[PDB]
From Swiss-Prot:
Keywords tagged on the record: Autophagy, Cytoplasm, Cytoplasmic vesicle, Lectin, Repeat
Cytoplasm keyword on record: yes
GO terms of biological process kind: cellular response to virus; lymphatic endothelial cell migration; plasma cell differentiation; T cell costimulation; xenophagy
Portion held of the full protein: 7 to 155 of 317
Tissue: Ubiquitous. Selective expression by prostate carcinomas versus normal prostate and benign prostatic hypertrophy.
Site feature: Critical for binding to sialylated and sulfated oligosaccharides: R53
Protein name as catalogued: Galectin-8
Methyltransferase in keyword set: no
């Protein structure tokens, strides 16, 4: 039931999500971390506005020094950071990210292994845009919708 919408998108990638993120929806992102990476992010956004900057419902931000920082941007202001230190990401290694949308939270597994949970701060129904930024190569972006 997984239907990819784009292959090898140029980064920064900003795209419209074709259907609503209802409970049970999956977002599947397949990529690869470059040799010189410092960090990258997957942002689930409300709109693609740049001025003013669009709210980010779910900021999923792997940093390579390593860790994953998650947060929410509302009215151009960042909320409280939720930091995961048990990170599966490494440089020169490929990955598969699966984001599960649940009623009350997102659930993320990388490479088949569970990674983290993140409670909704903005109602997921307000998400219509997917943004991927920073140092990362993306092989594919797909959705399995539950509408
Ligand atoms: O919370 C995610 C955002 O972090 C911002 O930087 C933080 C940094 O992570 C934290 O340790 C402390 O320095 O506060 C900073 C506020 O800017 C990034 O600038 C932003 O891109 C998000 O990743």
């Amino acid at each position: 039931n997984l239907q990819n919408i784009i292959y090898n998108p140029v980064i920064p990638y900003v795209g419209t999500i074709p259907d609503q993120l209802d409970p049970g929806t999956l977002i599947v992102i397949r990529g690869h971390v470059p040799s010189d990476a410092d960090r990258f992010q997957v942002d689930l956004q409300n709109g693609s506005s740049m001025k003013p900057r669009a709210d980010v419902a779910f900021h999923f931000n792997p940093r390579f020094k390593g860790c994953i920082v998650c947060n929410t941007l509302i009215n151009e202001k960042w909320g409280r950071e939720e930091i995961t230190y048990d990170t599966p990401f490494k440089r020169e290694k490929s990955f598969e990210i699966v984001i599960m949308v649940l009623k009350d939270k997102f659930q993320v597994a990388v490479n088949g292994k569970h990674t983290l949970l993140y409670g909704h701060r903005i109602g997921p129904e307000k998400i219509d845009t997917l943004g991927i930024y920073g140092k990362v190569n993306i092989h594919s972006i797909g959705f399995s919708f539950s509408s």
